């Protein structure tokens, strides 16, 4: 598997800060990396598809970006209902592996 | 012509020659020639036939899904849909076209191409797209309102389901055009209708295409 | 134009097979038979497999020499076993005398011999793709009406000479007429005489990062 | 809009049993459900009829044969359905195996009158790429404009007459390029119909 | 046609050829041809 | 008249390069590639640099022999890599078989092989002076539309032969038409492909004692 | 007394944007002070206009170009002034460096609309000798007879159309052979004026 | 023409020959010929174009100042100004002329030359000069009154600012003419005017020039 993994295992910021969570892929995965947001106990919603485009209902505070082999996600100002887990998912490497987690604190 | 002196170049074997040789089986009468349909006497007539471009050639996208340009609903206006250089004979989306392969059996070429687009969405789905072409001098335009001041064709696929973008001239002797597809309007559909369609591009070569200096390929 | 035609696309005679008359060491043959094959090298195969039916006669040249490029006076016999004649089986064999098999008697130290094989096929034209079974798994798509013959080459000798002779057969396609163009082969050639490919498909076009990047 | 292959109507070889509208009827084969996961189908030229009606009696009980065809594909699709087919007739369509066993099974080279679903339609199951398949005679079936495709094919072969149960001249492929899509509450399987009509057929060598 | 270069295929002996050669006995007048009955000029007429 | 014309001024085929097929000692190449270059020798350069645009096809002769003037029977292959074909890289290399690269198979003990290269240039005529930069310091005045090709020469062998072969390429200019005459170069040629001269200028005319002395 | 170079007026390539008297005006560049120590100047053919007015918009915002010129040099000199210029147009004027570093600086090969003063006018900065520069189209400016020189230059190149910002066809050199002289109490810098007028210009490949 | 015997001269390679050879790329269609302006088909038409002579070629004089003949004020009458032999193809002032270089690419030549002189002084400066030509037989004349009895042309550069001295014949087969410029009058100027001018000589070849037996040069 390509084994795209996120570097920050756990982060903590303020309610007005700008978090920057990455996901460093190993092989060439192209622009086929998604971000899945997981509740503390609920299901896992989607944020970004194809590394750039927001979903049909996601707020404006979230935004994706690409930089070489350092696919990342950056929240605008870290409003409420954000200190939850985060995942990066790619569907280029056919085993379809995942990353780790970016459970945010404050 | 009895006395002759052998000028230089004798006893040499030049492969690319049109010499003569003795028939190793005289008198032999080969099987006669019956009319078989579909003779092609020029590779130009093979180039001028439209075939598909792998415009979606991207890391990860496998199978036939490389021949499809995704045109979806929640792609806001003035956004970019796809772009591909006009270079039949450089590694890219043209590498799957009959022109993109024959042009790799030669060294130089020059002529006019054409890129017929085809919408494959529902009949009820309407909208509009901007298809702009940029000469080799400039670079890829950055915004929709920057490409409208070019050589484009606005495409209302709800009304007419297929257009053609004739490239004026593309010569390879020693910096190539770019074709971009911009979301002019949104993608509007009535209820109970899929909100994601596909565009299929087909490339060819106009009747002014020429080839020169045949050579082997790099597979 | 006039340089993209099918008559010029198949010109410029190229090497179709390097046969060797092994005669020294543990291979005291003294002769060798080379079955005439056009689709011997992938480069020529992929070009010939652009059309379905093709009709052409060929001119064969033999650039022979020793293994250190020297061309002594050694005599050579180039026998053309027609399509349907028994092939020789030894240096000293009755087949080497049959007057129905045309022979060319030239030496190593002479301009390469150059003959002209006619269009030798039962049907109207050669068939590179023959969907169907002959002899009304190891038989699908094997047309027997594409055999052009055999070229048997021996050094005219009595005992072993002790010199390997490498021959480079060169074939030129003349009077070519092609029918029913086909897409150019994209996958590799996993085996000869079959269109067999491999599981791991190779995309025709190279893969870039995103759809909107040049 | 009938794509006359290579610009040649099928004709009678000038001067054999020459059948008539009894055999020159419209054979309507079974329909095939076109789904989203569908990859494609292909039918050999005379093998699709060697067991169907009178043509199955004139072909098996003979020794030589030649005829054109009038392949005609139609898709009874709705107006909220989207998709696109590539209907092409491939002269001398030779199927190839896929080694990781070396030769194609007989069921895959003579599928009968049911056709064989493609296992790798991107490479036409024959090594050659699907992107260039348009060099063959073809017609698009785009559900937003039309759902019909008629191809007139002459007799393309080297010899004048040939066997009918061994050598299958061409193969009618039908491949969905843009897959089928529909919102919930629609017929989840668009039907595809194929009609065949031998044109200017001939036969020889009875029994 | 004074300057010539020898194209390949020289000094070769191809059995199935219709070349020419010098008559080893010029002036010689062979026995004339009298009409012998029953000439066959084709093996087809022998097959039939 | 008729002896000062431009058609005669460039006649009388001359040596344009002495290439050597190093094959013995510490240079067991067995092959050599010679990029076709007209402005190889100053004498021919200064003449060709009299005009700006020139159009001509060339006839190439190869006077090859060993290093003691003896001409054995060794076979040689003269492959003409066209302008835009990959060049060979070893004695045993796939490029030596490509049917698009015309080859000439002659021996050392044979009249020198003589081929005729056509006018191979994208533009209308060759450009010895190209004011401007290509590829829209190491690029000023380098026109890429003047390349005529490559001549790769190898001894058709299997193992090292142990004999160096010196080849003397001779080129004849035919059908020449010149445009825009220029002053003849006066300073030396400090480097190839550039008009670079040296600081110490050399006066065109010789210096005498006084202006009024003969 | 207009030296028509090679006896060919610039013409339109038979049948691209073909501009008119809006661009075919008289561009009067800055004057240059001709002193006694002066060595010479040279201006490239289309590079002298690539940043001047409309011609600077039609050249940069395009891809192909071809045009003649009407270079016209005048020297506002007195009658007690003496000197002589050699005004020549050099097709494919290629500048050369001078090693005691190997390639000419970009400022010396495309000086702009100001021209670059010669560093060794005896060798035309190109190895070739100035004494033979008269083989090019030229006209003398001898202050005792006339102070004007008009040269009509067609489009001289191999390809029909070519780039305008990369390939500069020719270069108008102006070299004083007999240096300027004057007694005390005169204008110590004779001014030299240059006027350009593109003739039969064309363009292609917009943006 | 079947039986032939090889006359001597076979298998030889003669460089200066007009033989034939096989085209190494048949079918190839080279780039067509468009009309490029300024074709020259004869080196004679290049010789007949006037270029400068380095008449001031002297030990020490460097730069462009070698192309200038100094005509000054305090050069008394009947004095000598300059002299140069008429030999286009021997090391001297002609070595910087298009004729002086082409004639070094050949072995023999014969024809008529011309030496156009040009005065580059002030407009107010007046005077007169004597320009005499001496055939190859005699030597350089010693005095002005000795050259007036020759083939000269008196030059009043105040009136006419340029003259031409046509050399009748100069043949090189196995002792060459001399051209001298004598101060006929003084160099008179009004006040406030420079008292030192220059003469510029230009050499060429008349329409009867011929060349023979092309050969390499000595740079």
From TrEMBL, chains B, H:
Protein name (record): Genome polyprotein
Family affiliation: Belongs to the picornaviruses polyprotein family.
Summary of subunit composition and partner proteins: Interacts with RNA-directed RNA polymerase.
Tree of life domain: Viruses
Localization (cell): Host cytoplasmic vesicle membrane; Host nucleus; Virion
Function per UniProt: Cysteine protease that cleaves viral polyprotein and specific host proteins. It is responsible for the autocatalytic cleavage between the P1 and P2 regions, which is the first cleavage occurring in the polyprotein. Also cleaves the host translation initiation factor EIF4G1, in order to shut down the capped cellular mRNA translation. Inhibits the host nucleus-cytoplasm protein and RNA trafficking by cleaving host members of the nuclear pores. Counteracts stress granule formation probably by antagonizing its assembly or promoting its dissassembly.
From TrEMBL, chains C, F:
GO biological process, one term: virion attachment to host cell
Record-given protein name: Genome polyprotein
Keywords: Capsid protein, Host cytoplasm, Host-virus interaction, Lipoprotein, Myristate, T=pseudo3 icosahedral capsid protein, Viral attachment to host cell, Virion, Virus entry into host cell
Protein's UniProt keywords contain Lipoprotein: yes
GO CC annotations on file: host cell; virion component
Domain Picornavirus capsid VP1: 1-183
Organism: Coxsackievirus A6
Compartment list: Host cytoplasm; Virion
Automatic annotation (TrEMBL), chains D, G:
Record's subcellular location: Host cytoplasmic vesicle membrane; Host nucleus; Virion
Family from the record: Belongs to the picornaviruses polyprotein family.
Assembly: Homodimer. Interacts with host GBF1. Interacts (via GOLD domain) with host ACBD3 (via GOLD domain); this interaction allows the formation of a viral protein 3A/ACBD3 heterotetramer with a 2:2 stoichiometry, which will stimulate the recruitment of host PI4KB in order to synthesize PI4P at the viral RNA replication sites. Homohexamer; forms a hexameric ring structure with 6-fold symmetry characteristic of AAA+ ATPases. Interacts (via N-terminus) with host RTN3 (via reticulon domain); this interaction is important for viral replication. Interacts with capsid protein VP3; this interaction may be important for virion morphogenesis.
Function according to Swiss-Prot or TrEMBL: Localizes the viral replication complex to the surface of membranous vesicles. It inhibits host cell endoplasmic reticulum-to-Golgi apparatus transport and causes the disassembly of the Golgi complex, possibly through GBF1 interaction. This would result in depletion of MHC, trail receptors and IFN receptors at the host cell surface. Plays an essential role in viral RNA replication by recruiting ACBD3 and PI4KB at the viral replication sites, thereby allowing the formation of the rearranged membranous structures where viral replication takes place. Capsid protein VP4: Lies on the inner surface of the capsid shell. After binding to the host receptor, the capsid undergoes conformational changes. Capsid protein VP4 is released, Capsid protein VP1 N-terminus is externalized, and together, they shape a pore in the host membrane through which the viral genome is translocated into the host cell cytoplasm.
Protein name, per record: Genome polyprotein
């Amino acid at each position: 598997d390509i084994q795209m993994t996120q570097s920050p295992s756990s982060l903590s910021a303020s309610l007005g800060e700008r978090v920057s969570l990455t996901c460093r892929a190993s092989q060439d995965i192209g622009s086929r990396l998604n971000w899945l947001q997981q509740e503390p106990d609920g299901t896992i919603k989607r944020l970004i598809y194809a590394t750039s485009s927001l979903d049909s209902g996601v707020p404006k505070r979230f935004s994706g970006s690409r930089s070489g082999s350092y696919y990342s996600l950056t929240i605008s100002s870290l409003e409420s209902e954000d200190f939850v887990d985060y995942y990066c998912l790619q569907y280029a490497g056919f085993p379809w592996t995942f990353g780790g987690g970016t459970k945010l604190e404050i | 012509g009895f006395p002759t002196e052998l000028k230089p170049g004798t006893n040499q074997f030049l492969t690319t020659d049109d010499g003569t040789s003795p028939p190793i089986l005289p008198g032999f009468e080969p099987t006669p020639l019956i009319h078989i349909p579909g003779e092609f006497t020029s590779l130009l007539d093979l180039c001028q036939v439209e075939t598909i471009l792998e415009v979606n050639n991207t890391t990860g996208t496998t199978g036939v899904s490389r021949l499809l340009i995704p045109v979806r609903a929640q792609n806001n206006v003035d956004q970019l849909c796809a772009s591909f250089q006009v270079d039949p004979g450089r590694n890219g989306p043209w590498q799957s076209t009959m022109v993109g392969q024959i042009c790799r059996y030669y060294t130089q070429w020059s002529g006019s191409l054409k890129v017929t687009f085809m919408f494959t969405g529902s009949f009820m789905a309407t909208g509009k797209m901007l298809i702009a072409y940029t000469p080799p001098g400039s670079a890829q335009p950055t915004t929709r309102e920057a490409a409208m001041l070019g050589t484009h064709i606005v495409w209302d696929f709800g009304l007419q389901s297929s257009v053609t973008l004739v490239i004026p001239w593309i010569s390879n002797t020693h910096a190539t055009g770019i074709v971009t597809i911009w979301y002019q309007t949104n993608f509007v559909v009535p209820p109970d209708t899929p909100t994601e369609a596909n565009i299929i591009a087909l490339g060819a070569a106009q009747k002014n295409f020429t080839l020169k200096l045949c050579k082997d390929t790099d597979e | 134009v006039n340089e993209a035609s099918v008559e010029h696309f198949y010109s410029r005679a190229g090497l179709v097979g390097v046969v060797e008359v092994k005669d020294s060491g543990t291979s005291l043959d003294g002769y060798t038979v080379w079955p005439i094959d056009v689709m011997g090298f992938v480069q020529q195969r992929r070009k010939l497999e652009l059309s379905t039916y093709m009709r052409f006669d060929a001119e064969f040249t033999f650039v022979s020499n020793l293994n250190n490029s020297t061309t002594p006076g050694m005599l050579l016999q180039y026998m053309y076993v027609p399509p349907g004649a028994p092939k020789p089986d030894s240096r000293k064999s009755y087949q080497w005398q049959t007057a129905t098999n045309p022979s060319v008697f030239a030496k190593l130290s002479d301009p390469p011999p150059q003959v002209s094989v006619p269009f030798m096929s039962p049907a109207t034209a050669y068939q590179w793709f023959y969907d169907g079974y002959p002899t009304f798994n190891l038989q699908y798509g094997q047309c027997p009406n594409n055999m052009m013959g055999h070229f048997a080459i021996r050094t005219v000798s009595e005992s072993t000479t002790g010199k390997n002779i490498h021959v480079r057969v060169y074939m030129r396609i003349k009077h070519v007429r092609a029918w029913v163009p086909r897409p150019l082969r994209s996958q590799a050639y996993m085996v000869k005489n079959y269109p067999t490919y491999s599981q791991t498909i190779t995309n025709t076009a190279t893969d870039r990062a995103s759809i909107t990047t040049t | 809009n009938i794509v006359l292959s290579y610009g040649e109507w099928p004709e009678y070889c000038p001067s054999p049993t020459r059948p008539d509208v009894s055999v020159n009827r419209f054979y309507t084969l079974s329909t095939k459900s076109w789904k989203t996961e569908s990859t494609g189908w292909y039918w050999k030229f005379p093998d699709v009829l060697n067991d169907t009606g009178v043509f199955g009696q004139n072909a098996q009980f003979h020794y030589l044969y030649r005829s054109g065809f009038c392949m005609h594909v139609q898709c009874n699709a709705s107006k909220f359905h989207q998709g696109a087919l590539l209907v092409a007739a491939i002269p001398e369509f030779v199927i190839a195996a896929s080694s990781p066993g070396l030769y194609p099974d007989f069921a895959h080279t003579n599928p009968g009158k049911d056709g064989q679903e493609f296992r790798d339609p991107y490479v036409l199951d024959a090594g050659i790429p699907l992107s260039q398949a348009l060099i063959f005679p073809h017609q698009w079936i785009n559900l937003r404009t039309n759902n019909c495709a008629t191809i007139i094919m002459p007799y393309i072969n080297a010899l004048p007459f040939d066997s009918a149960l061994n050598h299958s001249n061409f193969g009618l492929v039908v491949i969905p390029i843009s897959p089928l899509k529909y919102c919930n509450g629609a017929t989840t399987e668009v039907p595809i119909t194929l009609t065949i009509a031998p044109l200017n057929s001939e036969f020889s060598g009875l029994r």
